[PDB]
UniProtKB/Swiss-Prot annotation:
It comes from Conus episcopatus. Both tyrosine sulfation and C-terminal amidation are important for activity and structure stability. Does not show activity on alpha-7/CHRNA7 nAChR. This is Alpha-conotoxin EpI. Expressed by the venom duct.
Length: 16
């Protein structure tokens, strides 16, 4: 998933 990447977790609270 994108939350597998630290970036998506920070950048996108929608994704995570």
């Amino acid at each position: 998933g994108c939350c597998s990447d630290p970036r998506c977790n920070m950048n996108n609270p929608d994704y995570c």
